[PDB]
Amino acid sequence: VMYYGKGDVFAYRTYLKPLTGVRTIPESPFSGRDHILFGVNVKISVGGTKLLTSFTKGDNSLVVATDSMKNFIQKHLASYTGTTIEGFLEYVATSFLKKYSHIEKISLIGEEIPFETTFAVGNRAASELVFKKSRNEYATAYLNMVRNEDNTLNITEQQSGLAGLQLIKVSGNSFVGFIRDEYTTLPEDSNRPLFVYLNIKWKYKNTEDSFGTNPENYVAAEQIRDIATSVFHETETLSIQHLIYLIGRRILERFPQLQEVYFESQNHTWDKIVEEIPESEGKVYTEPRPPYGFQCFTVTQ
Amino acid sequence: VMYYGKGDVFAYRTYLKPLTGVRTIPESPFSGRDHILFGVNVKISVGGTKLLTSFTKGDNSLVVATDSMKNFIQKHLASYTGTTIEGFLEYVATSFLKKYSHIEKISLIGEEIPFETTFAVGNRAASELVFKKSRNEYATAYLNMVRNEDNTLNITEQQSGLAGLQLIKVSGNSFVGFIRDEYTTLPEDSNRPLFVYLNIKWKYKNTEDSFGTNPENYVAAEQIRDIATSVFHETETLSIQHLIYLIGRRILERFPQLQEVYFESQNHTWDKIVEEIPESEGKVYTEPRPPYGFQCFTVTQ
Amino acid sequence: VMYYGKGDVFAYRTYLKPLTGVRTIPESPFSGRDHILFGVNVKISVGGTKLLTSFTKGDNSLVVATDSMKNFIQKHLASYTGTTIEGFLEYVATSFLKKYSHIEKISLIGEEIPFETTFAVKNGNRAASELVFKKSRNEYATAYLNMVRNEDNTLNITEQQSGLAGLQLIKVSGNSFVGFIRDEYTTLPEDSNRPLFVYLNIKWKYKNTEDSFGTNPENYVAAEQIRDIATSVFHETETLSIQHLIYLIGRRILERFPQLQEVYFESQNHTWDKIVEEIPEEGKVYTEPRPPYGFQCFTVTQ
Amino acid sequence: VMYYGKGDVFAYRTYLKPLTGVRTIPESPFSGRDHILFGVNVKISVGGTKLLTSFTKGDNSLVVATDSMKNFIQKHLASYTGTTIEGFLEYVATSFLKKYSHIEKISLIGEEIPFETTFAVKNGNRAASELVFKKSRNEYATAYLNMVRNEDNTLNITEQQSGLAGLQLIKVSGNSFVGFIRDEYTTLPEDSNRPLFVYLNIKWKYKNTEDSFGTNPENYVAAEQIRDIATSVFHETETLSIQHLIYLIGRRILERFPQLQEVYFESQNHTWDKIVEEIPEEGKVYTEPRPPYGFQCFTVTQ
Numbered sequence A, B: 001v002m003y004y005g006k007g008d009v010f011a012y013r014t015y016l017k018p019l020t021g022v023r024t025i026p027e028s029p030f031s032g033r034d035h036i037l038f039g040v041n042v043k044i045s046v047g048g049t050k051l052l053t054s055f056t057k058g059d060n061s062l063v064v065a066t067d068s069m070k071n072f073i074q075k076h077l078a079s080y081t082g083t084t085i086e087g088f089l090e091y092v093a094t095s096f097l098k099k100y101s102h103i104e105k106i107s108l109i110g111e112e113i114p115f116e117t118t119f120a121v122g123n124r125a126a127s128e129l130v131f132k133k134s135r136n137e138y139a140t141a142y143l144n145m146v147r148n149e150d151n152t153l154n155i156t157e158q159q160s161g162l163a164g165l166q167l168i169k170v171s172g173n174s175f176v177g178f179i180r181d182e183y184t185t186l187p188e189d190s191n192r193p194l195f196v197y198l199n200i201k202w203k204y205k206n207t208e209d210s211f212g213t214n215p216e217n218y219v220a221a222e223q224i225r226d227i228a229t230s231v232f233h234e235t236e237t238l239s240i241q242h243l244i245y246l247i248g249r250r251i252l253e254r255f256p257q258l259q260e261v262y263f264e265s266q267n268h269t270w271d272k273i274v275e276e277i278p279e280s281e282g283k284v285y286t287e288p289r290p291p292y293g294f295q296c297f298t299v300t301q
Numbered sequence C, D: 001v002m003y004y005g006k007g008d009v010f011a012y013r014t015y016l017k018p019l020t021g022v023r024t025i026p027e028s029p030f031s032g033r034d035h036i037l038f039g040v041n042v043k044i045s046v047g048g049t050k051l052l053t054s055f056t057k058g059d060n061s062l063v064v065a066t067d068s069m070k071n072f073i074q075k076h077l078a079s080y081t082g083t084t085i086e087g088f089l090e091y092v093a094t095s096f097l098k099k100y101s102h103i104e105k106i107s108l109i110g111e112e113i114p115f116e117t118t119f120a121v122k123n124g125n126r127a128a129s130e131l132v133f134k135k136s137r138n139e140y141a142t143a144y145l146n147m148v149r150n151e152d153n154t155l156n157i158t159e160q161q162s163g164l165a166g167l168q169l170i171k172v173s174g175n176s177f178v179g180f181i182r183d184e185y186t187t188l189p190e191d192s193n194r195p196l197f198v199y200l201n202i203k204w205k206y207k208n209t210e211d212s213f214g215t216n217p218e219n220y221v222a223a224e225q226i227r228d229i230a231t232s233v234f235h236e237t238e239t240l241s242i243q244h245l246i247y248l249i250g251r252r253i254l255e256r257f258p259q260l261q262e263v264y265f266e267s268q269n270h271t272w273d274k275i276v277e278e279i280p281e282e283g284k285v286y287t288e289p290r291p292p293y294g295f296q297c298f299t300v301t302q
Ligand SMILES: O=c1[nH]c(=O)c2nn[nH]c2[nH]1
Pocket: A175, A186, A238, A239, A240, A241, A267, A293, D004, D063, D064, D065, D066, D067
């Protein structure tokens, strides 16, 4: 391995060109983003054989300073004329390889820094000025671009995602029928309040569709979130494994331009404390000990 | 000082009695809570002269185990027949002093663990089953109760609050006219994107009104949140100090049953990177260095 | 309430005057501080009735920008000629009130950012490095100071407190917790031998605030020495509870430092849950508990 | 991809077999581990094509509950008779594949939960305590292991890696960063003497996986010794960049441990910003930077 770069490059842009005309799906009201505020956290990694002596000899002649890479990203957010993080990553990548001929490979991660609307008043409406910083789920994007021997540039990998989704379904979930042996102490549960954390990532058949230039073909993280919550509600779940497969199948049915969906899920279900409350369908639970189950699974189109 | 207790007592209750009929205000749509899911993080502290020898002699005869205090709280969440955190704290407090005659003083903090609705589908609606765990703002409550010499119990202190509100207003804020001397390097800014964190706490004229038994008199954290966002939108702010005073005045005008409102605010405004973008009203900003300004201020009715 | 200020004012100073001339105790080899690297995180709060209209009218005329308070702290760390965080806070507070006549009260907190020595081979042998330090995320010293301006424009310290924060200690045996109340709320078993794991925050107040500054260092009480008393007493004691332990720690502190007026403890119980009791042919296995934690708050006075 | 498992499996063991018989190096006094207290955080991932219908059909017949995997790990820490995290992972992996025939692949990560010695006065003198330990939030050792079941039901290790995580080192002088590209994106000044602050994660692979287990301890490479090489080289070197430094650290590691095949570095730059350059009558003042951090990823091979 030989690469270097800059992490935690925060950049907030006001009044990015709005994303509009995204084809809708029945699980989600999403049709676009107003982009009054567009926040992103970028990580940039660059590589190339000509970087060797920066390591082996302490020669900085071909070192773009990581601080300069931060300036590059922030200046390019000011000049970007597109409408998505995926497209912003492409713009940065192409511009960086064009600028620095000694770099053979660039890898970028962009994480949305999400904001929510707030109420302002003779009637409450969404404010165009005041927004709430959200620490809940957020969109992500990843891009790798290389310079070939014939000096053409090529995207070698692209992936979009949704991170930090935390969903609890109070009833309508079972976990029964698993292996019972000398190591098993978990009771079977025919009705648990399954609490899952979800990170969902998708890849497109055609990299162009990720940029949003033709919004009809763009798959928004907001729509993925809404599919996940709908499928979870609809399904008598039999395990997290069962749930995530069904979510993936629905995503790929709604978005035929997608090639695959990948899931990283964790189980954070609470421990039950009070099983029966007189005169109520209610129950009391509490936080479990730290160990958490997880699942990782790809569904392909 | 001499007290002991239990912290991080998480307790999640399904199907608490709904809070309904809260008198509305124009800044907020809030009228109640369905309480399908009711999550709280409780801290309990107890004191009394009879605890001395548990410290000075290692005598545990009058030590209620902190683990038992956790069981007490979780069992009482199962039996609570009310509709608010404030009322739950009163129920726990009265029950604990009634149970343990050697305790002279109990202090409780309750923090909401908030959950948000999600979409499920032939039309999207809010799910009654699937909820999103939120890491954004949340309601709080605090209660202190004592046993008097004539053996009556009395609430000595009650306070409600909203914590973790993070609001950014992209324009319509200035900070000018402050002291310029040998220590001043901050440029005056006639139009900054003020980003404030807010913790807001209120006290009632009549402790009864905090419980929610008469919802007409209950002041919900959701309504406080919506007043804050409305006032921030409405105001050409001149500093955080100026903004929080105005928020407090509005709160006390809307809620005459309140005696005071207290604010703890922090300044997290971003540093500007790009001041002018051709053909746009947009700008680019980034995260500042760690130091943060803060303000603390009480407004009284 | 009405005040404002700046938090997370980090400041790192190289080559502060070393702390030496301290008075030793049996429980600690502490003999001073080299101060090649001195880091502090400062919070500053200021008040005064003349600040009212900055809130009620948006009048910034008497507002010292919080950014300027950060500059003030950082510049004064460069000029500070003393040897302790406590003395640094006094230097900042006195200087700030002298600069800003409309401020009536200042409150300061300083938290040490601790570094540990590393070793290097050079010129034939391994020795402590004067250049390379390891940042520590473990325990650290703290200080608190409040100062006021009186009607006659004199300045008085109104409260001072020192402390040690973030000490996490586990004793594998020699602790019991038995004899507590057993009623309809009790499910905790009696335990004659548990691996008690405590978090300790310990704070002390001096009889004479001058002794906190270090200008006569024999009278200073170092957080390092308090740390070492805590670990020694925990080892020495067949503990009957955390309450029992912290009282005995406090007694030892006050016996070793007669110039202290009191010591205050905030302790938390983070003891692990037992998984395996018997291992064939003296060990056991434990794991992390559920989140709820017991805590204790207790003062011992001289 | 298809796998599942359990994360944050904390396990604390008392009185593990001590590690001794290690081979020393000039840069480190490390001589073994007492193992009075041995803590580990384990993540376990398992796969196999027979798990498909647990996802596609909700059939739990071949699902080992993740809770049971936690039980498995905790119970095997009680029975483990070796002396290293690397050996513990092998013991767990081999045992798990032997128990569960439908599992084709297991991946394990173990992270040391480190504790430091404390001292106590007893029977007339201050000495290291055998009972009281301080939990550390600083650097810690790591291990990684992947094992597979072949068609003939033999088991093979397919990847092994050891490491040191969380090392944070600041060198106050004797570092430069000059000569980098100066163009329309450059605003960083050249600096002939900066207080370089690096975070280091260092990972190593052995030529022969057996040497990682500790059963012949003279061939084991301890994270403590790697830590001490890193601090020594940082002191010894007039650094020209972090890239320069980590290459030299890697060279020294590979020279001192010829049984290693390679060493991999993930470094981050957290150097403070300068506030005061000149202090009257050699110190300076620095403060925390904005969040963006440079990083480097680099392998040195034998
Ligand atoms: O959904 C689940 N999948 C699992 O693999 C599992 N293991 N324990 N609980 C579980 N729940």
